[PDB]
Amino acid sequence: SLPVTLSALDLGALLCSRICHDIISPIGAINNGLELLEEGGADEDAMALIKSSARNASARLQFARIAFGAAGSAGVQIDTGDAQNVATEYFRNEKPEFTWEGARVLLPKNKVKLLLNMLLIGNGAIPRGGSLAVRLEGSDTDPRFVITVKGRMLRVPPKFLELHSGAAPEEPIDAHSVQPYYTLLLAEEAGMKISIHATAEDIVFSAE
Amino acid sequence: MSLPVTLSALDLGALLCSRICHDIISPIGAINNGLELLEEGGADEDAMALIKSSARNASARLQFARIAFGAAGSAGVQIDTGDAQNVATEYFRNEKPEFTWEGARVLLPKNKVKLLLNMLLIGNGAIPRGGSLAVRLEGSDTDPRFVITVKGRMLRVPPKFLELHSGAAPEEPIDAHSVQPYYTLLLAEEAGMKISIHATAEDIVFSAE
Amino acid sequence: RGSMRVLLIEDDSAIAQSIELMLKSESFNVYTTDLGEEGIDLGKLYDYDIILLDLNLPDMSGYEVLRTLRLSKVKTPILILSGMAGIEDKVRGLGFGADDYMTKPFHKDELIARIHAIVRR
Amino acid sequence: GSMRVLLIEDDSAIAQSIELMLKSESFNVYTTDLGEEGIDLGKLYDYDIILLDLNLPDMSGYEVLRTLRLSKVKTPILILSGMAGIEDKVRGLGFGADDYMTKPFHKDELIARIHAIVRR
């Protein structure tokens, strides 16, 4: 169970800090690219930066709409096919090879918010790249989520391991560690436990 | 406490994020629609004007959100009102009304500045069809007071803020639309300040101290 | 011109510029109403090939306008454009089809194709 | 004899942004996306300035900083953050950074701070 509890003012402020940070990066890169065109010399290089950053701003906005922004009762259900679409588009410009396996089902919103948030933990697990494989098991009424990571560098993101294990962090939560915290908080609210198993070849994050 | 309903941390977080996303949907979309026009050709200076303005809009909204909604560190942390003035000014170069700031670049506790930036949002909401919005910073560093004054052809307190401020039980569930007035009032409570509404037929004055 | 005639009903003037340009760049003749500026002249609706309703601002209640249009049995087909959460349910509840609605953002190709699909049916 | 810049950055949209901007002013830019390589390149070669992100995968930006100074690298280090806050700047100054910037920034600002810091 979670070793620290963030007030509503704190969770809200940190979550927004995190979204702004992640979407500002491509948006800022876009403006930089536009500034380079009001000069000259790098016109084809600038345009390519503008185009990919725009595609990425959009992918990050779509992902955040569901992973952070979705709201309403557990009756507002979400289709994992929609999760797979925003996830696949998010991961185009991320480092790992991203694959998705499992039949489309409708789950309560908090379960799919969990799922997308675990992908971020997964992405942090293999910071120099590798593969991130999603597998949806079970039924719509008790699903199991399996995120399997492989890569040359391979870890559990330290703040995530710390919070998952019940130890109260030396450092205070910030817009970085808020996402692992948020992930654990979603899992409690959704009635699922996250598990972390390591082998020689991979790490498996699972929830059920 | 005087707020008619209380959101959980999970809800306040989800809805604030939802509001940030709603406010950048159209500028992100337009950048991508402009790029699409560009590639098929024919409207090249229009598509590029659209991309430039949309990209500037997105940046300005994200930067305003980063301070108005965002974290800024630990409990004792202060924010420069000078910074607030810059992100507020840039935000408003994109909005209907005309924007002015009267006040001395001072250091205030963070929630008092977040309060302040959130009152600009309410103020903007109060004049749907444009007009003027004027900020005035008064008081000491220990007892500051914000004055937001709006004038324009239509003039109503934004109904969800009216509802929550007067202590009414909300007619509708708090959502991404009403979360920002909820948040404005939540900040006021935490910062030990209170907001007043002075409505007349010429202007509305939103103030807190 | 002999090309398509479009009424674009907007609840926010600045948000619509993006959409005007996409429609115009296809050589559409585009007419606009700003709900924060003037009501809708319901006398002129049989004069357009299609009506676009663009909803973004909930305090503008442009959804109410859509109701009035529906209950009045306007014959010109209506395409609703929104990025708003919650609106898709309210709009399908009025009896609108799946192709009568489009979530934002969307590709220019998608808008233009859906418009042609609605008019030629 | 152009200006040499070590860029230690992971968010590839920012890196490409900084590369394009700097290279358009004839700077040489050597970028890495891992802090532990940053510590090695900064310990071993000569740069006019090191642009350093706080947000790095294999360690904190601050560890890169603190290790470079503990190893007595005198190369001036400009820190970049996507995460605003006065507290971050001051901690940076405490660890031996020359200056601090938040994303996004314009080309003009980055170039102006680089000259100011380096003095050429």
Ligand SMILES: [Ca+2]
């Ligand atoms: Ca990939």
Ligand SMILES: [Ca+2]
């Ligand atoms: Ca203005």
Ligand SMILES: [Ca+2]
């Ligand atoms: Ca050296």
Ligand SMILES: [Cl-]
């Ligand atoms: Cl509002």
Ligand SMILES: [Mg+2]
């Ligand atoms: Mg509109």
Ligand code: NA
């Ligand atoms: Na990665």
